[PDB]
Copies of this chain bind each other. A is one copy, B any other.
Amino acid sequence: ANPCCSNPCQNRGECMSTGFDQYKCDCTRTGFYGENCTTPEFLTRIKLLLKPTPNTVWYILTHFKGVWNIVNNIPFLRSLIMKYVLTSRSYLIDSPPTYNVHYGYKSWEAFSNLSYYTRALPPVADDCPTPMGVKGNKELPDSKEVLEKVLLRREFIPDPQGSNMMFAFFAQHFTHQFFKTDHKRGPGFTRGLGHGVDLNHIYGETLDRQHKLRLFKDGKLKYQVIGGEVYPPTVKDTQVEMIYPPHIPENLQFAVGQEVFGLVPGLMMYATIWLREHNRVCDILKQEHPEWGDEQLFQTSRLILIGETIKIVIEDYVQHLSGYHFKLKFDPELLFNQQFQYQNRIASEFNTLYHWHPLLPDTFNIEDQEYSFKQFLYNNSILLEHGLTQFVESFTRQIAGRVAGGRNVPIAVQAVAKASIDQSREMKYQSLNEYRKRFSLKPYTSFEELTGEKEMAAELKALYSDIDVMELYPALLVEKPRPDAIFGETMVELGAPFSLKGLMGNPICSPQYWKPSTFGGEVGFKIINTASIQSLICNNVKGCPFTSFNVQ
């Protein structure tokens, strides 16, 4: 019924109904005009020829390594390029946010209600004839069939980029502070009202939860010592609610910021490391400020660990998966002379892109042991058995699975991979090509172009019939990977804008926050600016084991 169901407006134009069977496109500041905003203005036509393809920019950044060696050592030039990286990506994000799962039009409810994930593209109207709008059949192909044919893992396909389990669990740990779906309300809702990197997975979402976790001495968080090693406190000691099976002994019920981090020892490993990092920073700040109280020591340490997290994510984590030879740089000053909104709203699609199920291995290999999913889940006894040192060394060695390329989703999490499909449909997501156009990508003309091969493409064509009906999430996992890369084009070109906007949109990156006094002086400021995944492990894990996000 809705005349906008066909998504007629192009180039980020906005569609509005002007009757029961008529519409109008708002071409304001899109650079285009005409009925569907497809006729480019003069300046627009120029940029279309100048601006390079994303597979060209990716090529430049991931090749000419000898040239980048020169550029990386020229601070002026390095800053110039990183500046362009930050600005060009964040331009794709609406800020302040617009739509959510319940509003395909702008409204104060959509803006003000922080319980929603926001949406980069509006939901398909409920009164639309087809799930994608007007194209396709009355119902999308069976999600179980999509899963089994092109998603489920036959043989384990390792990541050619060499991403290890330190990378895998970091991603899971890091993103679970702003991906906290409120399953009581629905998949389009979140419990992470900070909508960013606030480290609530360490300190707790609520003030009540934070105080139960705090020692209230020297700004530190509560902890316990087991075998001479520092571990998180227990549920019994702090009364913070955690998610554990009833058969789990209460001395193994560790209490941390995020309630689900008891799920896997890999998450509990990072929770422990970050816990130690907080208290380490407390000691350092106390050395500098003996006149400071517990409260200021805590708050300043939290701001410092936020800085470290963003530092590490940009210069280690993102640096790895991007495959760039350009040396990425966390420098908030790069945006001080730029137009930039220091705010963020977590997008539903960003959460969907981050469903990296194929990343998981078939077994979790710690030391000489090889644990199954059943043995690994909710089993912190494994962590106490081997220790953090053995955990880091083992996870540094074990490679992770390739995400793009198809058929690499471990069958142990098939219900989870199917939920992504189902829930994406439940949230009325628009098609793959709609999202590609939204982020300046050309639509795929065939399933073969999408997969880069023949077999899976044929399988998908039997299911979806039309390429313009192809869903976003399963397309990410079967997409033709970039040359020896872990991802396809869609994953990176869509995800980077959400990521960098979330990282740089943090208030500590703003000019009034980004100064030594915010972090207790130059000493605390230096902790942020010299942070790395290696130094994080070195300072907090016994023996200072070598670590990295790739296998050696």
Instruction: List residues of A whose CB falls within 8 A of some B CB.
Output: 14-20, 24, 26, 28-29, 94-96, 98, 103, 105-109, 111-113, 194, 198, 207, 288-292, 296, 299-300, 302-303, 306, 338-339, 341-343, 507, 510-513, 515-518, 520-521
Say yes or no: A521-B18 contact (C-beta < 8 A), given A341-B341, A342-B341, A512-B94.
Answer: yes
Q: Which single residue of chain B is at the shortest CB-CB distance from A96? A: B507
User: Would B341 and A20 count as touching, CB distance under 8 A?
Assistant: no
Q: Which residues of B contact A113 (CB under 8 A)?
A: 207
Which residues of chain B come closer than 8 Å to A98, judged between CB atoms? 512-513
Contact at B512–A299, with CB atoms within 8 Å?
no
Which 10 residue pairs are nearest across A and B when measured between Cβ atoms? A107-B299, A26-B517, A96-B507, A28-B515, A14-B517, A16-B517, A20-B291, A106-B518, A94-B512, A17-B291
| Contact B16 A520, beta carbon cutoff 8 Å | yes
B108 with A302: CB separation less than 8 A:
yes
The CA of A15 and the CA of B291, in the complex, are separated in Å by 14
Cβ of A409 to closest chain B Cβ, rounded Å: 36
* CB-based contact B112/A194 at 8 Å: yes
Distance A515 CA – B515 CA, assembled complex (angstroms): 37
Q: Are B510 and A303 in contact (CB under 8 A)?
A: no
Cα distance, A111 to B300, chains bound together (Å)? 13
A453 shortest CB reach to chain B, Å: 39
Q: Could you say which residues of chain B place their CB within 8 Å of the CB of A112?
A: 194, 198
| Inter-subunit contact B521/A299 (CB<8 Å) | no
What is the total number of copies of this protein in its complex? Answer: 2
**A342 close to B96 (CB less than 8 A):** yes
Cβ contact within 8 Å between B289 and A18: yes
Q: Is the CB of A17 within 8 A of B289?
A: yes
* Complex contacts, A289 vs chain B, CB 8 Å: 17-18
A515 touches B26 (CB 8 A): yes
Residues of B within 8 A of A303 (CB): 106-108
The smallest C-beta distance from A217 to any residue of chain B, in angstroms, reads 18
Closest B residue to A343 by beta carbon equals B343
Contact at B17–A292, with CB atoms within 8 Å?
Answer: yes
Assess the B292–A96 pair: CB atoms within 8 A: no
| CA–CA, A315 and B112, complex, Å | 26
Interface contact B17-A111, CB-CB below 8 Å: no
Which B residues touch A198, using CB under 8 A? Answer: 108, 112
Do the beta carbons of A106 and B513 come within 8 Å of each other? yes
Pick 25 A–B contacts, CB within 8 A, sort by A. A14-B517, A17-B291, A18-B288, A18-B289, A20-B291, A28-B515, A28-B516, A29-B515, A94-B512, A95-B510, A95-B512, A96-B342, A96-B507, A96-B512, A106-B303, A106-B513, A106-B517, A106-B518, A107-B300, A107-B302, A107-B303, A108-B306, A111-B507, A112-B194, A341-B342
Q: A96-B507, A107-B296, A107-B300 are in contact. List 16 more A-B contacts (CB 8 A).
A: A14-B515, A17-B292, A19-B290, A26-B515, A28-B517, A95-B512, A98-B512, A103-B299, A105-B299, A107-B299, A108-B306, A109-B299, A111-B507, A341-B341, A341-B342, A341-B343
Residues from chain B with Cβ under 8 Å of A521 in the complex: 16, 18, 24
Q: How far is the CB of A300 from chain B (nearest CB, A)?
A: 7
A513 touches B96 (CB 8 A): yes
A400 CB, min distance to chain B CBs, angstroms:
32
Q: Which of A291, A292, A513 gathers the greatest number of chain B CB atoms within 10 Å? A: A291
